[PDB]
Amino acid sequence: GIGTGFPFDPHYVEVLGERMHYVDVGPRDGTPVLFLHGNPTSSYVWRNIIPHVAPTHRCIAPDLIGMGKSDKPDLGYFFDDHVRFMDAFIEALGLEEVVLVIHDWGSALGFHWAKRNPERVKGIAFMEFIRPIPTWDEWPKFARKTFQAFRTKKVGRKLIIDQNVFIEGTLPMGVVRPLTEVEMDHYREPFLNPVDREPLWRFPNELPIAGEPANIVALVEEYMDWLHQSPVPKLLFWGTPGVLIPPAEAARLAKSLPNCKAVDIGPGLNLLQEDNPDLIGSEIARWLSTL
Ligand SMILES: [Ca+2]
Ligand SMILES: [Ca+2]
Ligand SMILES: [Ca+2]
Ligand SMILES: [Ca+2]
C-alpha cells in the first residue's frame, strides 16, 4: 500500500573524486528542495514523499557518501567526513537557494550547512533530527542496551559490522508498521558486503550523548542556537513515541523555535517517512506554496 518501488532515474556526480548518486526530478522553475537521509537509509527513504512535492518543485535527494548507490571510499565516516562530501555535493549542483527536508543524520548535515550558509536556505522541514541527548535516560528504554553496545569497544562493531544488526534489526525497529521483503532488499543492498558497513557503525558512535563526542555536542548545540534565532521558515514533523524526538521535545521546540509549525503524524518511531509518507509529503507541498 505504501509504495516499495524506486522509480527514479539515477543521476551521478563526482564529489571530491568519488561518485555520488542522487535523485533529481521536477521542474527547475524556482527553488529546489534538497532531501537528506540519515542512518541506515538512502534516498530510498524519500521515495513516497518526493511525488507529493515534484509536481510544483524540483526535488534533489542524494545518497550520502558510503551509502545507497554512492561510492564507498576508505574513510572513518565521521560526521566531519559527511560534511566535506555534502558541502561539495551541493556546490557541484550549481544551485543557489534551497529548501531543506532533512532526517536523522541528514538533519545534522542540513542544519550545520544552513547555519554556515543562511542566505541560501528558504525553509527547513525536519523530523526525528539530531539533538543533544543529556543522559542515557533520554534514549528510549526499548533500544537502550543495544545502542549502548553499539558504542562499546569491540561489542558494537561485532553487532553492526559482522552481524549487520543495524540493517536486519535496528531499521525495522525504527518503523511502527512492518517492512516488506522488497523494502528490506532496497535497504540491505548497499551493505551486503561487511567491509562496507563502517558508516552504519560510526554514526551511532557520533550521537551526542552525555557530552560525547564533544565535537558533535558542540556543533549541534551551535546550530540549535542558530535555529532559535533565525527567522527561517520551519516545519517539524513528529510522532509517538518517536526515538530521537519525544513528543514532549517536539512540543517544546514548536513554542521556542521562531516561525515553526509542528505536525503530529500519529504513530512513529524514527523513520517517520515509512509510517505516514502521505501526511509528510502532502504537508511539505502545502507549506512550500506558502513560502
Ligand atoms: Ca575517483
Ligand atoms: Ca564508546
Ligand atoms: Ca517484515
Ligand atoms: Ca545553547
Residue numbers in the entry: 3 to 293
Task: Show sentences the authors wrote.
The self-labeling protein tags (SLPs) HaloTag7, SNAP-tag, and CLIP-tag allow the covalent labeling of fusion proteins with synthetic molecules for applications in bioimaging and biotechnology. To guide the selection of an SLP–substrate pair and provide guidelines for the design of substrates, we report a systematic and comparative study of the labeling kinetics and substrate specificities of HaloTag7, SNAP-tag, and CLIP-tag. We complement these kinetic studies by reporting crystal structures of HT7 and SNAP covalently labeled with rhodamine-based fluorophores, providing a detailed understanding of their substrate preferences.
The HT7 variant HOB (halo-based oligonucleotide binder)52 features several positively charged surface mutations close to the substrate binding site, which were introduced to increase the labeling rates with chloroalkanes attached to oligonucleotides. This suggests that kinetics of negatively charged substrates might suffer from charge repulsions at the HT7 surface. HOB comprises four surface mutations compared to HT7 close to the substrate entry channel but opposite the TMR binding site. These mutations lead to a small but significant increase in labeling rates (3.1-fold) with negatively charged CA substrates relative to HT7. Because the HOB mutations replace mostly negatively with positively charged residues, we analyzed the electrostatic potential of both proteins. While HT7 features an overall negatively charged surface around the substrate entry channel, HOB shows a positively charged patch opposite the fluorophore binding site.
